[PDB]
Amino acid sequence: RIEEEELTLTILRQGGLGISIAGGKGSTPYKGDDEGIFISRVSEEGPAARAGVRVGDKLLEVNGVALQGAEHHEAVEALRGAGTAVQMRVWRER
Amino acid sequence: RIEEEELTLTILRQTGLGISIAGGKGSTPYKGDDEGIFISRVSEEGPAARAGVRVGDKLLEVNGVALQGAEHHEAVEALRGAGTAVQMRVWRE
């Protein structure tokens, strides 16, 4: 992890975040041996795209809920109950 | 981690190991955001090269010492005190 390089993006839900997530502890890794939660898809018309979310981003926190080393369902539950504003901490390569 | 995809290579220490490691928790990552212990160099004439070790391998255990989430010095101490036979399991591919 590189927490000093992480980004914070806020999705203003209008139901509907306009993303797909993949991965999780014990799941088939999204890339290499990384079992993290990744943004696998971003809808061009959804709020996540407008908030600056991109495919390939690694999801590390959602509204205070830490997702480092989390199982897939834990991220889903954190995102489904996040509320109108979904503050996500992500890491991307630059 | 993918334990089903890991390799186990046994290095016969020379009367060294012929490798360099880099990375570790809190250190500059060897690649991306991965703070794991990586093989950064492999001497072409050293025992690690002949034992099948390759640059880029992620080091996960050395003679029972688990290195997942370990600091750099923990890997060094585990490898330096491993003995004449250094059984390390790594992940590649």
Binding site: - | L17, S20, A22, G26, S27, T28, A75, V76
Partner: peptide, 9 residues
């Protein structure tokens, strides 16, 4: 902004 560590063994 971290310490890069590399050790020859």
């Amino acid at each position: 902004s971290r310490t890069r560590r590399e050790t020859q063994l």
